[PDB]
Short mmCIF file of all heavy atoms in Angstrom, two decimals:
data_model
loop_
_atom_site.label_atom_id
_atom_site.label_comp_id
_atom_site.label_asym_id
_atom_site.label_seq_id
_atom_site.Cartn_x
_atom_site.Cartn_y
_atom_site.Cartn_z
N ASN A 129 -15.73 31.01 -11.89
CA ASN A 129 -15.47 32.04 -12.86
C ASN A 129 -16.18 33.36 -12.57
O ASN A 129 -17.23 33.41 -11.91
CB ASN A 129 -15.70 31.55 -14.27
CG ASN A 129 -14.47 30.82 -14.85
OD1 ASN A 129 -13.27 31.23 -14.68
ND2 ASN A 129 -14.75 29.74 -15.52
N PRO A 130 -15.59 34.47 -13.02
CA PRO A 130 -14.31 34.61 -13.75
C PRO A 130 -13.13 34.56 -12.76
O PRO A 130 -13.02 35.41 -11.90
CB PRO A 130 -14.44 36.01 -14.40
CG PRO A 130 -15.35 36.79 -13.46
CD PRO A 130 -16.26 35.79 -12.83
N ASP A 131 -12.34 33.49 -12.81
CA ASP A 131 -11.47 33.14 -11.71
C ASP A 131 -10.33 34.15 -11.47
O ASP A 131 -10.08 34.50 -10.32
CB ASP A 131 -10.96 31.70 -11.78
CG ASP A 131 -10.19 31.36 -13.00
OD1 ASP A 131 -10.22 32.14 -14.00
OD2 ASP A 131 -9.59 30.29 -12.99
N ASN A 132 -9.61 34.63 -12.50
CA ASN A 132 -8.57 35.56 -12.23
C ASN A 132 -9.06 36.80 -11.53
O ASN A 132 -8.44 37.31 -10.58
CB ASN A 132 -7.86 36.05 -13.52
CG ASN A 132 -7.25 34.94 -14.35
OD1 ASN A 132 -7.97 34.02 -14.80
ND2 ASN A 132 -5.96 35.08 -14.66
N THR A 133 -10.17 37.34 -12.01
CA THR A 133 -10.69 38.57 -11.42
C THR A 133 -11.33 38.32 -10.04
O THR A 133 -11.09 39.11 -9.12
CB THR A 133 -11.64 39.28 -12.35
OG1 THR A 133 -10.85 39.66 -13.49
CG2 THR A 133 -12.28 40.51 -11.73
N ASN A 134 -12.03 37.19 -9.89
CA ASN A 134 -12.52 36.85 -8.58
C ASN A 134 -11.38 36.73 -7.57
O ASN A 134 -11.53 37.17 -6.42
CB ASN A 134 -13.28 35.54 -8.65
CG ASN A 134 -14.62 35.64 -9.39
OD1 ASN A 134 -15.19 36.71 -9.52
ND2 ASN A 134 -15.19 34.48 -9.70
N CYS A 135 -10.26 36.13 -8.01
CA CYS A 135 -9.10 35.99 -7.15
C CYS A 135 -8.53 37.35 -6.72
O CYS A 135 -8.25 37.61 -5.56
CB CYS A 135 -8.05 35.17 -7.88
SG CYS A 135 -6.63 34.71 -6.86
N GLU A 136 -8.36 38.23 -7.70
CA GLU A 136 -7.88 39.59 -7.41
C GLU A 136 -8.80 40.27 -6.38
O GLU A 136 -8.32 40.92 -5.45
CB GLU A 136 -7.80 40.39 -8.70
CG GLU A 136 -7.34 41.82 -8.55
CD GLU A 136 -5.93 42.03 -8.09
OE1 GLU A 136 -5.07 41.20 -8.36
OE2 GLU A 136 -5.67 43.13 -7.49
N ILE A 137 -10.09 40.22 -6.61
CA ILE A 137 -11.03 40.88 -5.70
C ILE A 137 -10.94 40.27 -4.31
O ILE A 137 -10.97 41.01 -3.31
CB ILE A 137 -12.47 40.86 -6.31
CG1 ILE A 137 -12.55 41.71 -7.59
CG2 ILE A 137 -13.51 41.29 -5.31
CD1 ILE A 137 -12.24 43.19 -7.42
N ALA A 138 -10.93 38.93 -4.21
CA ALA A 138 -10.85 38.33 -2.87
C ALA A 138 -9.58 38.79 -2.17
O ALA A 138 -9.64 39.21 -1.00
CB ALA A 138 -10.89 36.85 -2.96
N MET A 139 -8.47 38.79 -2.89
CA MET A 139 -7.20 39.19 -2.32
C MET A 139 -7.23 40.65 -1.84
O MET A 139 -6.77 40.96 -0.75
CB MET A 139 -6.11 38.96 -3.34
CG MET A 139 -4.72 39.40 -2.89
SD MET A 139 -3.43 39.18 -4.11
CE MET A 139 -4.03 40.09 -5.49
N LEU A 140 -7.76 41.55 -2.68
CA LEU A 140 -7.83 42.96 -2.28
C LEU A 140 -8.63 43.21 -1.04
O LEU A 140 -8.42 44.17 -0.33
CB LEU A 140 -8.43 43.80 -3.42
CG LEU A 140 -7.52 44.00 -4.66
CD1 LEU A 140 -8.30 44.69 -5.73
CD2 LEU A 140 -6.20 44.76 -4.32
N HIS A 141 -9.59 42.32 -0.79
CA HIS A 141 -10.49 42.46 0.36
C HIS A 141 -10.16 41.51 1.51
O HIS A 141 -10.99 41.32 2.38
CB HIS A 141 -11.92 42.32 -0.13
CG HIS A 141 -12.33 43.46 -1.01
ND1 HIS A 141 -12.23 43.43 -2.38
CD2 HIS A 141 -12.83 44.68 -0.70
CE1 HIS A 141 -12.62 44.56 -2.89
NE2 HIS A 141 -13.01 45.36 -1.90
N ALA A 142 -8.94 41.01 1.53
CA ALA A 142 -8.49 40.11 2.59
C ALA A 142 -7.35 40.79 3.35
O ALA A 142 -6.15 40.56 3.11
CB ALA A 142 -8.05 38.78 2.00
N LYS A 143 -7.70 41.62 4.31
CA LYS A 143 -6.73 42.59 4.83
C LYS A 143 -5.56 41.96 5.59
O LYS A 143 -4.45 42.50 5.59
CB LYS A 143 -7.44 43.62 5.67
CG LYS A 143 -7.84 43.16 7.04
CD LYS A 143 -8.63 44.26 7.77
CE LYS A 143 -9.15 43.79 9.12
NZ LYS A 143 -9.82 44.89 9.86
N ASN A 144 -5.81 40.81 6.23
CA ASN A 144 -4.76 40.14 7.02
C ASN A 144 -4.01 39.05 6.22
O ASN A 144 -3.17 38.34 6.77
CB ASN A 144 -5.36 39.45 8.25
CG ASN A 144 -5.97 40.40 9.21
OD1 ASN A 144 -5.52 41.52 9.36
ND2 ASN A 144 -7.04 39.95 9.90
N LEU A 145 -4.31 38.94 4.93
CA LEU A 145 -3.62 37.96 4.05
C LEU A 145 -2.74 38.70 3.03
O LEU A 145 -2.70 39.93 2.99
CB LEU A 145 -4.63 37.01 3.39
CG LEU A 145 -5.45 36.19 4.38
CD1 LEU A 145 -6.46 35.35 3.63
CD2 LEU A 145 -4.54 35.27 5.18
N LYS A 146 -2.00 37.93 2.25
CA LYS A 146 -0.96 38.43 1.36
C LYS A 146 -1.12 37.80 0.00
O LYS A 146 -1.86 36.81 -0.18
CB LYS A 146 0.42 38.08 1.93
CG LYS A 146 0.63 38.67 3.30
CD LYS A 146 0.80 40.17 3.28
CE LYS A 146 1.23 40.72 4.68
NZ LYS A 146 0.28 40.34 5.79
N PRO A 147 -0.45 38.36 -1.01
CA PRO A 147 -0.56 37.74 -2.34
C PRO A 147 -0.21 36.25 -2.41
O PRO A 147 -0.82 35.50 -3.17
CB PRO A 147 0.38 38.63 -3.19
CG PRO A 147 0.33 39.97 -2.50
CD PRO A 147 0.29 39.64 -1.01
N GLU A 148 0.73 35.82 -1.59
CA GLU A 148 1.15 34.43 -1.55
C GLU A 148 0.03 33.48 -1.11
O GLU A 148 0.13 32.27 -1.30
CB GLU A 148 2.34 34.32 -0.58
CG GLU A 148 3.64 34.99 -1.08
CD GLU A 148 3.58 36.53 -1.23
OE1 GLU A 148 3.00 37.24 -0.37
OE2 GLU A 148 4.13 37.00 -2.28
N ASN A 149 -1.05 34.00 -0.55
CA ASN A 149 -2.15 33.17 -0.14
C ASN A 149 -3.15 32.83 -1.26
O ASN A 149 -4.06 32.05 -1.00
CB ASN A 149 -2.95 33.84 1.01
CG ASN A 149 -2.15 34.02 2.30
OD1 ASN A 149 -1.69 35.11 2.58
ND2 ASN A 149 -1.99 32.96 3.06
N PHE A 150 -2.96 33.38 -2.45
CA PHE A 150 -3.99 33.31 -3.51
C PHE A 150 -3.46 32.82 -4.83
O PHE A 150 -2.39 33.26 -5.28
CB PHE A 150 -4.60 34.70 -3.75
CG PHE A 150 -5.41 35.19 -2.59
CD1 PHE A 150 -4.84 35.95 -1.59
CD2 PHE A 150 -6.75 34.88 -2.47
CE1 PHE A 150 -5.57 36.37 -0.46
CE2 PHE A 150 -7.49 35.28 -1.37
CZ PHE A 150 -6.90 36.05 -0.37
N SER A 151 -4.25 32.01 -5.51
CA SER A 151 -3.98 31.67 -6.89
C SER A 151 -5.29 31.27 -7.57
O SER A 151 -6.28 31.04 -6.87
CB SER A 151 -2.91 30.58 -7.01
OG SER A 151 -3.34 29.36 -6.46
N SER A 152 -5.26 31.17 -8.89
CA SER A 152 -6.39 30.77 -9.68
C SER A 152 -6.02 29.63 -10.61
O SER A 152 -4.85 29.39 -10.92
CB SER A 152 -7.00 31.93 -10.44
OG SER A 152 -6.14 32.46 -11.45
N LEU A 153 -7.02 28.83 -10.99
CA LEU A 153 -6.83 27.58 -11.71
C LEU A 153 -6.79 27.74 -13.21
O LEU A 153 -7.82 27.97 -13.82
CB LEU A 153 -7.97 26.61 -11.33
CG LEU A 153 -7.80 25.20 -11.86
CD1 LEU A 153 -6.59 24.53 -11.27
CD2 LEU A 153 -9.00 24.37 -11.61
N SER A 154 -5.63 27.48 -13.80
CA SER A 154 -5.48 27.43 -15.26
C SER A 154 -5.05 26.01 -15.72
O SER A 154 -4.97 25.77 -16.91
CB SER A 154 -4.57 28.55 -15.77
OG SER A 154 -3.38 28.47 -15.10
N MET A 155 -4.93 25.07 -14.78
CA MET A 155 -4.45 23.74 -15.22
C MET A 155 -5.45 22.91 -16.05
O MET A 155 -5.01 22.01 -16.75
CB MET A 155 -4.00 22.88 -14.01
CG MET A 155 -2.54 23.15 -13.64
SD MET A 155 -1.34 22.80 -14.92
CE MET A 155 -1.71 21.06 -15.18
N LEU A 156 -6.74 23.17 -15.96
CA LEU A 156 -7.65 22.48 -16.84
C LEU A 156 -7.31 22.79 -18.29
O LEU A 156 -7.30 21.90 -19.14
CB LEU A 156 -9.11 22.84 -16.57
CG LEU A 156 -10.19 22.23 -17.44
CD1 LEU A 156 -10.09 20.69 -17.50
CD2 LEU A 156 -11.54 22.69 -17.01
N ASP A 157 -7.08 24.07 -18.59
CA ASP A 157 -6.76 24.44 -19.94
C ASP A 157 -5.41 23.88 -20.39
O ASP A 157 -5.24 23.45 -21.54
CB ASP A 157 -6.76 25.96 -20.08
CG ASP A 157 -7.99 26.52 -19.48
OD1 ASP A 157 -8.06 26.72 -18.20
OD2 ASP A 157 -8.88 26.79 -20.31
N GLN A 158 -4.45 23.87 -19.47
CA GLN A 158 -3.17 23.25 -19.78
C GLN A 158 -3.33 21.77 -20.11
O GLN A 158 -2.77 21.28 -21.10
CB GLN A 158 -2.14 23.44 -18.65
CG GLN A 158 -0.85 22.76 -18.97
CD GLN A 158 0.27 23.04 -17.99
OE1 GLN A 158 0.55 24.21 -17.74
NE2 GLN A 158 0.98 22.02 -17.54
N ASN A 159 -4.07 21.04 -19.30
CA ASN A 159 -4.30 19.62 -19.51
C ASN A 159 -4.99 19.39 -20.85
O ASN A 159 -4.61 18.47 -21.60
CB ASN A 159 -5.03 18.98 -18.34
CG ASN A 159 -4.14 18.84 -17.13
OD1 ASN A 159 -2.92 18.75 -17.24
ND2 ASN A 159 -4.76 18.74 -15.98
N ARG A 160 -6.00 20.19 -21.15
CA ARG A 160 -6.66 20.11 -22.43
C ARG A 160 -5.67 20.26 -23.57
O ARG A 160 -5.73 19.55 -24.60
CB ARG A 160 -7.77 21.13 -22.61
CG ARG A 160 -8.99 20.82 -21.81
CD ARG A 160 -9.96 21.96 -21.81
NE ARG A 160 -11.22 21.60 -21.20
CZ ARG A 160 -12.10 22.48 -20.73
NH1 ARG A 160 -11.80 23.78 -20.75
NH2 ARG A 160 -13.21 22.00 -20.23
N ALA A 161 -4.80 21.27 -23.44
CA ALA A 161 -3.84 21.56 -24.50
C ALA A 161 -2.83 20.44 -24.69
O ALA A 161 -2.51 20.08 -25.82
CB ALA A 161 -3.13 22.86 -24.20
N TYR A 162 -2.39 19.86 -23.57
CA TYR A 162 -1.46 18.73 -23.70
C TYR A 162 -2.09 17.55 -24.42
O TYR A 162 -1.43 16.95 -25.31
CB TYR A 162 -0.94 18.27 -22.32
CG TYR A 162 0.38 18.90 -21.91
CD1 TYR A 162 0.41 20.09 -21.17
CD2 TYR A 162 1.59 18.32 -22.24
CE1 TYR A 162 1.59 20.69 -20.78
CE2 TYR A 162 2.77 18.92 -21.87
CZ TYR A 162 2.78 20.07 -21.12
OH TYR A 162 3.98 20.64 -20.76
N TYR A 163 -3.29 17.20 -24.08
CA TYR A 163 -3.88 16.05 -24.74
C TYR A 163 -4.07 16.32 -26.24
O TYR A 163 -3.78 15.48 -27.09
CB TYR A 163 -5.18 15.67 -24.06
CG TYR A 163 -5.56 14.25 -24.47
CD1 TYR A 163 -5.15 13.11 -23.69
CD2 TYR A 163 -6.26 14.00 -25.63
CE1 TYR A 163 -5.50 11.81 -24.09
CE2 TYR A 163 -6.62 12.74 -26.07
CZ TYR A 163 -6.21 11.63 -25.27
OH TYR A 163 -6.54 10.37 -25.61
N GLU A 164 -4.50 17.53 -26.57
CA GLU A 164 -4.75 17.85 -27.96
C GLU A 164 -3.46 17.77 -28.77
O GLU A 164 -3.42 17.21 -29.84
CB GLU A 164 -5.40 19.23 -28.06
CG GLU A 164 -5.40 19.87 -29.40
CD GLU A 164 -6.22 19.07 -30.44
OE1 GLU A 164 -7.07 18.24 -30.06
OE2 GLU A 164 -5.97 19.27 -31.66
#
Side-chain angles (χ1 to χ4, degrees):
Chain A
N129 275 319
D131 60 346
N132 301 59
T133 296
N134 290 338
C135 187
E136 179 65 30
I137 294 298
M139 177 182 57
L140 288 174
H141 294 92
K143 76 184 176 175
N144 296 327
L145 300 176
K146 301 289 189 302
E148 291 65 42
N149 297 102
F150 292 91
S151 66
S152 66
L153 187 64
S154 55
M155 274 299 303
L156 178 55
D157 312 83
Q158 178 172 307
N159 287 334
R160 286 170 173 161
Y162 266 91
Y163 197 93
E164 165 62 20

